[PDB]
Assembly symmetry: D2
Homo-oligomer: 334 residues x 4
């Protein structure tokens, strides 16, 4: 099975990819990293993390490498993926975490550069898109470029799946109250064409567009076109929550909904359950993609008109990274 990985974009996601691989003692070896900076800066960022603390393994660097837990990782600095010399250390699967290659057309450049497969850490149009433990059985040996969608997708999908499977989702809308991320702004100023994204992220509630509900059909085909939603980006550094308001195909109670969700999270490494009164910092470092929270379930009904609100936590950094790695490990073995 494929064992050698390259990371393009050693950022919030990319660094945590490495951390998680070492944490679970994967047989996958990161042999090369591509970014835009020096091994020194990358080593500093890897060692020191504002959200997860000190790196649990040794970190050193040379003029062209990192040395992590005694093992050498090549560092390249090629801004165009086609130029990355992936063949030098035999990088087979590229974990694409820059945000700049979010299409099949763009990410195939890695193949041109000598890789064999690409797993994109973000939605990437209508390509094969996987939420582990929702539709990873759609992966096969001919899949060369795959997406794991967004963290919000990885949160929304398992909850939507469980509801759809148990009760039917006829139509629904999502709002995720989401930690700020690097696409936003530190101080008020231009941030491409999105006006809201220009505003100081740690000082505002900021409405934000997300494709998680719009594109749910890639992951749950029967919900294709049945969901919409958006985000409110807020001042927490990581840790996020997704609310879904649904018309279901059945009259339900809160307990019935909660029991169905509990069943779907039983023996499920991707999808956790809680009935404790947690808050967002309690999900930081979660090993799930999504944690359904039974305490926030709400059924609002007048006669036969019924709205169902269901809420799941997610650590948009590490929790999501756990999903990307489970997908990666399976990808490497097809």
């Amino acid at each position: 099975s494929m064992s050698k990985v390259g990371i393009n974009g050693f950022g919030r996601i990319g660094r945590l990819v490495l951390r998680r691989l070492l944490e679970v003692k994967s047989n996958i070896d990161v042999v090369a990293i591509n970014d835009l900076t020096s091994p020194k800066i990358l080593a500093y960022l890897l060692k020191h993390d504002s959200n997860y603390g000190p790196f649990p393994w040794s970190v050193d660097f040379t003029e062209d490498s990192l040395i992590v837990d005694g093992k050498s990782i090549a560092v390249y600095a090629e801004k165009e993926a086609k130029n990355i010399p992936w063949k030098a250390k035999g990088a087979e699967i590229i974990v694409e975490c820059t945000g700049f290659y979010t299409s099949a057309e763009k990410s195939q450049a890695h193949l041109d550069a000598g890789a064999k497969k690409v797993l994109i850490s973000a939605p990437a149009g209508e390509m094969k898109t996987i939420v582990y433990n929702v539709n990873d059985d759609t992966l096969d040996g001919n899949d060369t470029i795959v997406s794991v969608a967004s963290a919000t997708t990885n949160c929304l999908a398992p909850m939507a799946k469980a509801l759809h499977d148990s009760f039917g989702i006829e139509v629904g809308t999502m709002t995720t109250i989401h930690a700020y991320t690097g696409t936003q702004s530190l101080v008020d100023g231009p941030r491409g064409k999105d006006l809201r994204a220009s505003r100081a992220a740690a000082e505002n509630i900021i409405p934000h567009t997300t494709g998680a509900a719009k594109a749910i059909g890639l992951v749950i085909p029967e919900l294709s076109g049945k969901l919409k939603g958006h985000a409110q980006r807020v001042p927490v550094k990581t840790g996020s929550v997704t609310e879904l308001v649904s018309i279901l195909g059945k009259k339900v109670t809160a307990e019935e909904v909660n029991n169905a969700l509990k069943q779907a999270t039983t023996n499920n490494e991707s999808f956790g359950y809680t009935d404790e009164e947690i808050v967002s910092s309690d999900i930081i470092g979660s090993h799930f993609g999504s944690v359904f929270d039974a305490t926030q379930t709400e059924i609002t009904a007048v006669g036969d008109l019924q709205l169902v609100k269901t809420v799941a936590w997610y650590d948009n950094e590490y929790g999501f990274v756990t999903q990307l790695i489970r997908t990666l490990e399976k990808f490497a073995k097809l």
Copy 2:
């Protein structure tokens, strides 16, 4: 007619009440303030405000009074309202902003203590409850204890009223993404029996119960029992947003919902409109109770089914206070 007011609880809401009364050059006369502390400390807090900056008028104090814009205000420190000596300076209407007297039974104390009327800055059970420019016409000459509900109620109600009047609301659910408040905790520690309220407010997304939707029937009786909702408390110091997901009585477009709401905000001092891409800091200092945001309107439709998401902003401190003062001015004259 009644012109002399006392404020119980010179807190975030209590101090802004005075600021607003001065700002609009009210004929109402604040003659007394009760709290738990010295004039010195109350004077310091009035003068220097972390959210709204320097107090626009002069402030001084003596051992038992504040002197605000040259006028003397008596200061009392009675922790039981029934002991507050309101007859001394002839306080007739009490603006009750402590959070400790949120029922008719409890606020009866101010009347026993020699006041004539009480206006509670919070929900207070099944009593007359006023959102100005939604149901202020229900205020009556024999009312002696009334509520202005919560800021969230002042945000939700005019949006709900508009939608219901134009389209009918059949059922609906609310989530407010809401600035943290003094009911929460600075560091993790006991905060009565609300476990979530025990958690560090500026470092977490914190689900929180609110009655704004549940008790909406006090303000819009046709909507009794048709709404539920809750809050997510987040790390902004003031400025909040309310989302409502509704099943309406008619099929609609976004443009149609937005035009109805625009008409409802026309010449409406309590309820504003924007189609700008604002964020929470842009609402701080608002003179509305609610500002409907056309940019966030969302219609999700599958077949005969439709969900409608509408969103309004609110300064849960100053905005809400502008509503409290409109209600007080009218209350004072009946």
Copy 3:
């Protein structure tokens, strides 16, 4: 073989909860048998399990109507606002870790001895009493001590830096400023907070000057420096992790390398006082197992003629870092 001292914690707050965490983490021979606070087992269990700064508790937590069950061991829970009413004898708690902020003097903490405990270790400055910064002056403890202080997190950060400088070069005079994470003494929203006007102001929205005795009372820890230091704090919006700057006139003209080498030697094989030459920031100190970490990167010598100002800087996790010092002192104090 092992000294098995029975401990009670008064005030199961930020510090009190981390005291239990840390004792379990190091597999201490101390048994915590009782906790007193102002609330229910249910609420203490919630707070112990979920921590905004340090994440999930590493052991199981449950509660009954009158106890916590932590990793399978029962800890009695009391809620007596007056320490004299705490039934410390019921489970044989002998050494009280006093972490409420309300008994910070010999006369006040006497209440624990009257209620049947034998010794009190106060998690804060407590006036003129034996005041210990571990690995600075813990040799001054003896069998006769019954009530002792570990001073502030700021003292635990200042003292080892000041000791090293004094021993190597002599400090003639100095002033400190700590840029310090906000704590529970401050305010969430603007509102009354005792008599400290500045403490009334929203802690997560302001730089707030704040008085601290860390420098003023340094003589309790390093007698040779009594009266030679002053300082204060600026409280700022980070949830934990703080930094202490000291500006000093030394007894000897120095270079930055010379100051850094001296401080390096002082941190060698020193479980309480760490060193760094990496470009760390406050979140890097969160969860530190040192009372203080000297930062060679911020050393600064300013010199004109024969006049020299030396600025030296140390990080500290004012929560967990300080707690590790508290525990080291607790373990010693319990054996005496």
Copy 4:
């Protein structure tokens, strides 16, 4: 008298420059703005400010300009200053606020492009560097490129000047506890070569080099080489404080220090005084470059040895901008 100005870099400082010019009714006209974006996004940014709230004047835009208070201001988007069409509108003095032209040789490009003078809103090496009400008497009719140093310089300088004039400073070191700015990072990631600048600014105390003290000699020639210092960047959006530890030329008391400072601030529009127990949010919107705070003065004396700690607040955005404008007004008339 020159009165056409162009702003290069319409950022936090650039937009506040225009706000302050309008506020003081300057006879200077901003006729052009260069940035990297559209009029629509600049207009949005001008209108809505996370630190200072809504713009006090009307703001609109066309395809090629802003309309501010009914007056037209051209907008350009030239990355290289030598391409900026300053002559089109006859922009005479360029207020240089991008941070990319902080040297005589770099800001020369504006003069090559047709402007007559340049005021750089930052330290710009060994050039004339003005703190208004400290050394603005050094400006003359022959000057073409000048600096107003940093906000920290505008804070430090007036306090250093009062101390030195009254007592002599023999040596000193500064620490500014300073609001985070746009040179820092929102999430941990590369920010050129400065390792500490890579770290999430709203979640850390971050040491930071600054030359405010190092280069004080350009402003107070007698202190040249007598001061060092640095910054701790912390999570407040604006509003900063500067501490100075000095060895003075005589023995002093705290009362004596504070009276000397009170005196230096009397009828001084650039330099204020306080003995109120203020916090950083209270300095936001200050019309001073610096506000000396008598409550934080501390004298540490051991026989002949004495350390004097003096402290001054500054709004590093708006307050500094008031100083920049004062200097601009004078620069325009020589």
